[PDB]
Amino acid sequence: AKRTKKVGIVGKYGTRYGASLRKMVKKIEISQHAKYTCSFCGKTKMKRRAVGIWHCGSCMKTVAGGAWTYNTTSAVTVKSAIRRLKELKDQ
């Protein structure tokens, strides 16, 4: 059955630290402990090892990513911008 109405993963913190702080850390912890689909082997085994380090158990590929998510939106926009400036730089 459903065990918690709204706290979900931050039910381990009990009543402590304040509702808003628990809500703020809930999505961060969900993304932190989630398993992402590896972009090299295609298996959903790419999980965080330490902060910023993401390791796939299947192909043993280690990727430098965000603190809590596999890639940050900042880095994605940066990669797109660098691609555009590369294709602009050459002709």
Partner 1 sequence: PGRGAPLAKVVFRDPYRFKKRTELFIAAEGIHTGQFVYCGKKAQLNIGNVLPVGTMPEGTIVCCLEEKPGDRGKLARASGNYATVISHNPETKKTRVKLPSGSKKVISSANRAVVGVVAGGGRIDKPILKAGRAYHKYKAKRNCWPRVR
Task: Tell me if 85 contacts partner 1 by CB under 8 A.
Answer: yes
Q: Is 45 annotated as a binding residue?
A: no
* Closest to 36 measured CA to CA, from 11, 10, 61: 61
Task: Tell me if 89 contacts partner 1 by CB under 8 A.
Answer: yes
Residue 75 interaction partner, one of Zn ion, partner 1, RNA, none, beta carbon < 5-8 Å per kind = partner 1
Work out which of 37, 67, 78, 80 binds RNA, going by CB under 7 A: 67
CA Rg value for the chain:
18
Q: Which residues pair with 48 in a beta bridge?
A: 54
Task: Tell me if 37 contacts partner 1 by CB under 8 A.
Answer: no
Taking the mean position of all CA atoms in its chain, how far away is CA 79?
A: 17
Task: Tell me if 42 contacts partner 1 by CB under 8 A.
Answer: no
Q: Is 41 annotated as a binding residue?
A: yes
The residue to which tokens 């059955």 are assigned:
1
